[PDB]
Scaffold this active site. Structure first.
Site, mmCIF file in Angstrom:
data_model
loop_
_atom_site.group_PDB
_atom_site.id
_atom_site.type_symbol
_atom_site.label_atom_id
_atom_site.label_comp_id
_atom_site.label_asym_id
_atom_site.label_seq_id
_atom_site.Cartn_x
_atom_site.Cartn_y
_atom_site.Cartn_z
ATOM 1 N N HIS A 497 0.788 -1.222 0.000
ATOM 2 C CA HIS A 497 0.000 0.000 0.000
ATOM 3 C C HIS A 497 0.838 1.300 0.000
ATOM 4 O O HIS A 497 1.051 1.900 -1.055
ATOM 5 C CB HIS A 497 -0.942 -0.056 1.205
ATOM 6 C CG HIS A 497 -1.808 1.154 1.371
ATOM 7 N ND1 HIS A 497 -2.086 1.742 2.580
ATOM 8 C CD2 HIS A 497 -2.461 1.900 0.441
ATOM 9 C CE1 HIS A 497 -2.874 2.795 2.358
ATOM 10 N NE2 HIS A 497 -3.132 2.939 1.074
ATOM 11 N N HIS A 688 -3.950 0.464 -6.361
ATOM 12 C CA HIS A 688 -4.251 1.067 -5.064
ATOM 13 C C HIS A 688 -5.623 0.643 -4.558
ATOM 14 O O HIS A 688 -5.799 0.347 -3.376
ATOM 15 C CB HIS A 688 -4.189 2.606 -5.156
ATOM 16 C CG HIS A 688 -4.574 3.299 -3.885
ATOM 17 N ND1 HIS A 688 -5.761 3.964 -3.694
ATOM 18 C CD2 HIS A 688 -3.929 3.362 -2.691
ATOM 19 C CE1 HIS A 688 -5.793 4.391 -2.422
ATOM 20 N NE2 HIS A 688 -4.699 4.049 -1.765
ATOM 21 N N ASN A 692 -6.140 -1.089 -1.261
ATOM 22 C CA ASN A 692 -6.688 -0.166 -0.261
ATOM 23 C C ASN A 692 -8.169 -0.344 0.135
ATOM 24 O O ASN A 692 -8.502 -0.270 1.318
ATOM 25 C CB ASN A 692 -6.403 1.296 -0.734
ATOM 26 C CG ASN A 692 -6.816 2.382 0.289
ATOM 27 O OD1 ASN A 692 -5.964 3.057 0.959
ATOM 28 N ND2 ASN A 692 -8.128 2.582 0.395
ATOM 29 N N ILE A 836 -6.734 8.449 -1.178
ATOM 30 C CA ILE A 836 -6.886 8.198 0.246
ATOM 31 C C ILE A 836 -6.120 6.961 0.696
ATOM 32 O O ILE A 836 -6.100 6.724 1.913
ATOM 33 C CB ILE A 836 -8.385 8.030 0.608
ATOM 34 C CG1 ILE A 836 -8.553 7.953 2.121
ATOM 35 C CG2 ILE A 836 -8.947 6.762 -0.049
ATOM 36 C CD1 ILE A 836 -9.852 8.485 2.598
HETATM 37 C C1 LIG Z 1 -7.607 10.250 5.327
HETATM 38 C C2 LIG Z 1 -7.057 8.840 5.065
HETATM 39 C C3 LIG Z 1 -5.599 8.877 4.577
HETATM 40 C C4 LIG Z 1 -5.008 7.465 4.407
HETATM 41 C C5 LIG Z 1 -3.468 7.475 4.407
HETATM 42 C C6 LIG Z 1 -2.876 6.163 3.866
HETATM 43 O O1 LIG Z 1 -1.729 6.392 3.015
HETATM 44 C C7 LIG Z 1 -1.503 5.735 4.293
HETATM 45 C C8 LIG Z 1 -1.180 4.257 3.986
HETATM 46 O O2 LIG Z 1 -0.512 4.164 2.712
HETATM 47 C C9 LIG Z 1 -0.249 3.709 5.053
HETATM 48 C C10 LIG Z 1 -0.437 2.649 5.851
HETATM 49 C C11 LIG Z 1 -1.726 1.865 6.011
HETATM 50 C C12 LIG Z 1 -1.497 0.483 6.654
HETATM 51 C C13 LIG Z 1 -2.773 -0.378 6.665
HETATM 52 C C14 LIG Z 1 -2.477 -1.860 6.367
HETATM 53 C C15 LIG Z 1 -3.463 -2.805 7.081
HETATM 54 C C16 LIG Z 1 -3.650 -4.129 6.319
HETATM 55 C C17 LIG Z 1 -3.679 -5.346 7.269
HETATM 56 C C18 LIG Z 1 -4.990 -6.128 7.235
HETATM 57 O O3 LIG Z 1 -6.055 -5.370 7.600
HETATM 58 O O4 LIG Z 1 -5.075 -7.309 6.920
HETATM 59 FE FE LIG Z 2 -4.416 4.642 0.417
#
Ligand SMILES: CCCCC[C@H]1O[C@@H]1[C@@H](O)/C=C\CCCCCCCC(=O)O
Ligand SMILES: [Fe+3]
Length: 836
Positions: A497, A688, A692, A836
């Site tokens: 991600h 993404h 995401n 996002i």
């Molecule tokens: C207003 C919202 C903004 C969002 C910002 C995002 O970029 C940040 C992202 O890349 C960084 C890290 C996110 C890590 C989440 C991974 C969890 C997956 C594990 C699972 O659940 O199995």
């Molecule tokens: Fe994201």
């Protein structure tokens, strides 16, 4: 002579500003009528003294146009006739001056011409601050796309000029109203002034931690460290890269920022005090999160409820209760996530279905240096596979490509002792899966590795566990997969991600704006996919991946989270990012001209891949048609100064740490640009979204997607093994993410998995009429029609009963790759960009 009729469309600040929208004739528009805003046409065909086009008289706005059949929400229209005449050429650009003090968002300008010429359109979409702050008037060009020829001779100087205005060189502290794009290293996540313990490594500009560059902001350096940049509550990004919204609910970044300043502390005061138990006591206590919800003190519930955006998203039962929407994963069966079947399925259709590899040999080796677990295999033996199934030798299995692996060993090994010294206790896992004949994947063996038995050389200290349907062996096995998922959760979050999407794309957005004119054809092809990306990344550096951020506090790798991704960046190669290239690299596909996509897939029931190949081909076909519409030959490309300057900067600067990698495409061919543009677009949209948008639906249940590990595997018969026996559920709860962090993680990934109501989807969506090139407009319509075709094709697939993997025991049809969606926590939808 003549008088060219003009129609100006703009939106007032308090229509897009988050402060105003807090709530979302009267004629405030009368303020725009005096001598508040002036426009000045620039000739596209009549050159003055030397080259530079001829300007017209400065015309101020006179008259509100109360209605247009094509107006829109929050928009305002104004009439303004310009004095022109035969001989003054055709208007090709124009200057605007705002004397209003308050800035406004200019949407567009249309001109009911004079000579044999149709209406001329200008799509602006820019914030116009007071004219006093620039010294060089804000310029805007007509609908026409032109190669770096800068074509209209009289316009040529206006084109390069604006380019020079966008780069601004690299000095000074960037201010809110500026539109300057430039690079800088990752050196603002840490806080060296607030403690030598708060200092974080600078990522990029060095061999050890290479990293893509980020958008330059020039705050003064840190006191304790000059190489570090001062922290601020306001990170700068060129104006315009920050998109406003008509509704108080689509300001998702705001909701994320406010969850990291207001919601966090207040939430801990309930723990730090005692108004809520600190740890979950049963799975039943976890399920109650989506039913009753975390009973919270009234005092708190009064604050973390009214604030902007955090509405609806934070399901409330009036007071106390803080309910969470039930994740799609436990909607039908709250027990299916424990299935080995679902565990393996999510490796092909889950939140991170990009990692799985096809085993080429046995046992699996390592990419680590002189230590012996890298100089010689893993400890998974050949007499450990197939506990009742077919009955094929390991070779026969490998021979018919039936063995696959999820390798989570190398990245965390080097940091294990360090991480294990904190309140976190983790393993460097590996797991082998067998492809059953029924089409399903099944976990055959998990290998839990620890570092250095003694010393570090030959640090291969592993323990391999095997699937167990009965007794304490299943409790041990259910913990085994949890140690793997904690590894995966973290790798996904930081690399799949943040790194492969968010971080890797920023340098392209900077390089593009710095060298390709808004009028350039390639600029227009790429732009839609850069929407709000620099904005969300700025919030990330601020409240996500920073010194004490949510990620350092919620995930396994902790304070070493980002450095490690920079170590992973060591192995990133642009061209392997293309899906077909990715598939082959992993052994999940082989080149086969016969097949519908030039490649043959191992495991045909691989959701992410079967669906993604469709969208990949759709994107690629579209870019090709677009590109070959503008470039006549391959030489036409080698002659493009803006494109060539753009690619050189991307390679040598933006991703400067890899500027010497031999796999960088040379912009010497039209085919290489199609490929490059396809990957960028693939990365900003489908990749993404695939990685995401399934975060909460799958991970909205901490049990299924744990973020960190706090205990080592209970031993033989110790009191840790005896409680596993008497109370397995509690043994699981104590091994994974605690209650406080679970509450944080859910809060954040519920926002991250949402679609704003004004999301522009890949589904043939743009803002207005970006171009006047009819041929492109048609190619764009074809692209859109193929997407709609694809969507139906994918929905039919979700009905095919012979494709269990699209739903699994959880009954969750795979819809993450369906182009369209309506809004919210939809387990579907492909946005044009990383928003996002
Ligand atoms: C207003 C919202 C903004 C969002 C910002 C995002 O970029 C940040 C992202 O890349 C960084 C890290 C996110 C890590 C989440 C991974 C969890 C997956 C594990 C699972 O659940 O199995
Ligand atoms: Fe994201």
């Amino acid at each position: 002579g003549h008088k060219i009729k003009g129609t100006v469309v703009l939106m007032r600040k308090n229509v897009l500003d988050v402060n105003s929208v807090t709530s979302v004739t009267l004629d405030t528009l009368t303020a725009f009528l005096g001598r508040s805003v002036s426009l000045q046409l620039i000739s596209a065909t009549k050159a003055d003294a030397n080259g530079k086009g001829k300007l017209g008289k400065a015309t101020f706005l006179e008259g509100i146009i109360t209605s247009l059949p094509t107006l829109g929400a929050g928009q305002s229209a104004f009439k303004i006739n310009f004095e022109w005449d035969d001989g003054s050429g055709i208007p090709g650009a124009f200057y605007i001056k705002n004397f209003m003090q308050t800035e406004f968002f200019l949407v567009s300008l249309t001109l009911e011409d004079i000579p044999n010429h149709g209406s001329i359109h200008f799509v602006c979409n820019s914030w116009i601050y007071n004219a006093k702050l620039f010294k060089s008037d804000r310029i805007f060009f007509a609908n026409q796309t032109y190669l770096p020829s800068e074509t209209p001779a009289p316009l040529v100087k206006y084109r390069e000029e604006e380019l020079h205005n966008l780069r601004g060189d690299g000095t000074g502290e960037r201010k809110e109203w500026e539109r300057i794009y430039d690079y800088d290293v990752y050196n603002d996540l840490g806080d060296p002034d607030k403690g030598e313990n708060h200092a974080r490594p600078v990522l990029g500009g060095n061999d050890t931690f290479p990293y893509p560059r980020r958008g330059r902001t020039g705050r003064k350096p840190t006191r304790k460290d000059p190489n570090s940049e001062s922290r601020s509550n306001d990170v700068y990004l060129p104006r315009d890269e920050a998109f406003g919204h008509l509704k108080s609910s689509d300001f998702l970044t705001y909701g994320l920022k406010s969850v990291s300043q207001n919601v966090l502390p207040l939430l801990q005061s309930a723990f730090d005090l005692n108004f809520t138990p600190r740890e979950f006591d049963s799975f039943d206590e976890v399920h109650g999160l989506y039913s009753g919800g975390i009973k919270l003190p009234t005092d708190i519930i009064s604050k973390i409820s009214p604030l902007p955006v955090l509405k609806e998203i934070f399901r409330t039962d009036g007071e106390q209760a803080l309910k969470f929407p039930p994740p799609k994963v436990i909607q039908v069966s709250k027990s299916a996530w424990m299935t080995d079947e679902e565990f393996a399925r999510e490796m092909l259709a889950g939140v991170n279905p990009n990692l799985i590899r096809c085993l080429k040999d046995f046992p699996p080796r390592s990419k680590l240096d002189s230590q012996v677990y890298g100089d010689h295999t893993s400890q998974i033996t050949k007499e450990h596979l197939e506990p009742n199934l077919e009955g094929l030798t390991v070779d026969e299995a490998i021979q018919n490509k039936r063995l696959f692996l999820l390798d989570h060993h190398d990245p965390i090994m080097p940091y294990l002792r360090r991480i294990n010294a904190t309140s976190t206790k983790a393993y460097a896992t590996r797991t082998i899966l067998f492809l059953k004949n029924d089409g399903t994947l099944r976990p055959l063996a998990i290998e839990l590795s620890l570092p250095h038995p003694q010393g570090d050389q030959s640090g291969a200290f592993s323990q391999v566990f095997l699937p167990a349907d009965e007794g304490v062996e299943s409790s041990i096995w259910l913990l085994a997969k949890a140690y793997v998922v904690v590894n995966d959760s973290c790798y996904h979050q930081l690399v799949s991600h943040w790194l492969n999407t968010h971080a890797v794309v920023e340098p392209f957005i900077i390089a593009t704006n710095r060298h390709l004119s808004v009028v350039h054809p390639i600029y227009k092809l790429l732009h839609p996919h850069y929407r709000d990306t620099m904005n969300i990344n700025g919030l990330a550096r601020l409240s996500l991946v920073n010194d004490g951020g949510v990620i350092e506090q919620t995930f396994l790798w902790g304070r070493y989270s980002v450095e490690m991704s920079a170590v992973v960046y060591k192995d990133w190669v642009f061209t392997d990012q293309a899906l077909p290239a990715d598939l082959i690299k992993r052994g999940m596909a082989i080149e086969d001209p016969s097949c519908p996509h030039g490649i043959r897939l191992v495991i045909e029931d691989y959701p992410y891949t079967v669906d993604g190949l469709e969208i990949w081909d759709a994107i690629k076909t579209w870019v090709h048609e677009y590109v070959f519409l503008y470039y006549k030959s391959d030489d036409t490309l080698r002659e493009d100064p803006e494109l060539q300057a753009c690619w050189k900067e991307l390679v040598e600067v933006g991703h400067g740490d890899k500027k010497n990698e031999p796999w960088w495409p040379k912009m010497q061919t039209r085919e290489e640009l199609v490929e490059a543009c396809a990957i960028i677009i693939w990365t900003a949209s489908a990749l993404h979204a695939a990685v995401n948008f399934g975060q909460y639906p799958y991970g909205g249940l901490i049990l299924n997607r744990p973020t960190l590990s706090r205990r080592f595997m209970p031993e033989k018969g110790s009191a840790e093994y005896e409680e596993l026996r008497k109370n397995p559920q509690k043994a699981y709860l104590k091994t994974i993410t605690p209650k406080f962090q679970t509450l944080i993680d859910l809060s954040v990934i519920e926002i991250l998995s949402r679609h704003a109501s004004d999301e522009v989807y890949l589904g043939e969506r743009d803002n207005p009429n970006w171009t006047s090139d009819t041929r492109a407009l048609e190619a764009f319509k074809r692209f859109g029609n193929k997407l709609a075709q694809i969507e139906n094709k994918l929905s039919e697939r979700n009905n095919d009963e012979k494709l269990r993997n699209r739903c699994g025991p959880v009954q969750m049809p795979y819809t993450l790759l369906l182009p369209s969606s309506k809004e919210g926590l939809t387990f579907r939808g492909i946005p044009n960009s990383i928003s996002i």
